[PDB]
Amino acid sequence: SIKVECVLRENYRCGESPVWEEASQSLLFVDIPSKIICRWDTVSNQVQRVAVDAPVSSVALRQLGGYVATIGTKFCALNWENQSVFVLAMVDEDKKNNRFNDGKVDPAGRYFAGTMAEETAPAVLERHQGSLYSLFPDHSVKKYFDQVDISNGLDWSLDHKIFYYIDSLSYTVDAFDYDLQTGQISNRRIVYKMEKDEQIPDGMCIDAEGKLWVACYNGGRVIRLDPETGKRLQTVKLPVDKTTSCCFGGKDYSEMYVTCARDGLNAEGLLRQPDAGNIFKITGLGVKGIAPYSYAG
Ligand SMILES: OC[C@H]1O[C@@H](O)[C@H](O)[C@@H](O)[C@@H]1O
Ligand SMILES: OC[C@H]1O[C@@H](O)[C@H](O)[C@@H](O)[C@@H]1O
Ligand SMILES: OC[C@H]1O[C@@H](O)[C@H](O)[C@@H](O)[C@@H]1O
Ligand SMILES: [Ca+2]
C-alpha cells in the first residue's frame, strides 16, 4: 500500500530543500537556478513565489516570523508579506564562484548550511571548495570543516547527540558526535556506503524511529538506512531519475514529499520522464517523520 503520486506539476528546473509548514499546511522549497523560493498551499493548491537575485539553495522556517534562506553564499531573512529579503551573514567571500547548497535547522534553532563550487554540469566543478557552516541565533557564523565537494543532506539523531551529513561526491552518509548546547561536532565516521545503482546521495531526513531516508540523485529512488548497522532497510522508486531531496509532512508527518530536477536531461530524457521537475508525494511508508525546527534568530 505504498503509493507514489505526482502532486504538483510545475516543471521546476531543480526542486530542492522541501520543508513542511504545519501552521499553513504548506510545502516550502526552492527551485535553485530559477532563483525562486516557493510556498505551496496544499489546501487551496496555490503556489506563491519569491524571486531572489541569485541561486537559492535552501529555505527554513524562522521562529520569530517568516523564513530564512541561503541565496548565493549569503544567509538571508525573508518577510513574506513585504517580500523583503535581507542579509544576516555572508560566507566564502574568499571564493570567486561558490554558492550554498543544502541546509537545515538543528534542534537548538541553528541554521546549518554548506557550500560548493558552482557547477558547469551536474557533478562537474572545481573540487573541495565547499565548507559546512552554521548560523547561530546570534547571527554569528561557525565554520565546521572545509574540503567539501558538494555539501548536501543533513539531519540530527532523535537524542540530539549525533549529526548526520552528506557530501554528495563522497558517496557516503557520515556521522559526527554532536553537542546540542554548543552546536559543536566531532568524530566524523562513515555510517552508510552508497551502492553503485544508488548513484549520488543528495537530500536526507530522519524518521521517528531514527532511520535515515536519502534521495538518490540519478538513482530515481529514496532509500531507508539504519545508521547503527550501515544496512539499507528499504528502497522506493520514482518515475523520475533526478530525485533531489525528501521530507515528511502532512497529517502527523505521515506523508513524504520528494523533490526532483529536469536540468541535465537531454530531449530523450525529458520525454522518458514527463514529470521531471515536479513534486512527488509518497504515502503508506508505515513510519512518520518529525517536525522541522525553526531558526532561532
Ligand atoms: O513573514 C510571514 C510569515 O510568518 C510566518 O510565521 C507565518 O507562519 C507565515 O504564514 C507568514 O507568511
Ligand atoms: O580566509 C578568510 C575567509 O575564510 C572563509 O572560510 C570564510 O568563509 C570567508 O568569508 C573568509 O573571508
Ligand atoms: O550533487 C547532486 C546535486 O545536488 C543538488 O543538491 C545540487 O544543488 C546540484 O547542483 C547537484 O548536482
Ligand atoms: Ca541537494
Numbering used by the authors: 3 to 299
Give sentences copied directly from the paper behind this entry.
Biochemical studies suggested that SMP30 is a gluconolactonase (GNL, EC 3.1.1.17) and requires a divalent metal ion such as Zn2+ and Mn2+ for its gluconolactonase activity. In the ascorbic acid biosynthesis pathway, the ring structure of d-glucuronate is cleaved to generate l-gulonate, and then a γ-lactone ring, which is a basic structural framework of ascorbic acid, is formed from l-gulonate by SMP30/GNL. The crystal structure showed that human SMP30/GNL adopts a six-bladed β-propeller fold, which is similar to those of squid diisopropyl-fluorophosphatase (DFPase), drug resistance protein 35 (Drp35), and paraoxonase (PON).
One hydroxyl group of d-glucose, OH(1), was coordinated to the divalent metal ion. The hydroxyl groups OH(2), OH(3), and OH(4) faced one side of the inner surface of the substrate-binding cavity, as observed in the mouse SMP30/GNL–1,5-AG complex, and formed hydrogen bonds with Arg101, Asn103, and Glu121. Residues on the opposite inner surface of the substrate-binding cavity (Cys16, Ile202, and Tyr219), however, formed no hydrogen bonds with the bound glucose. On the opposite side of the inner surface, there are fewer polar amino-acid residues (Cys16, Ile202, and Tyr219). Due to this asymmetric arrangement of polar residues in the substrate-binding cavity, substrate/product(-analogue) molecules are placed in a specific manner in the cavity.
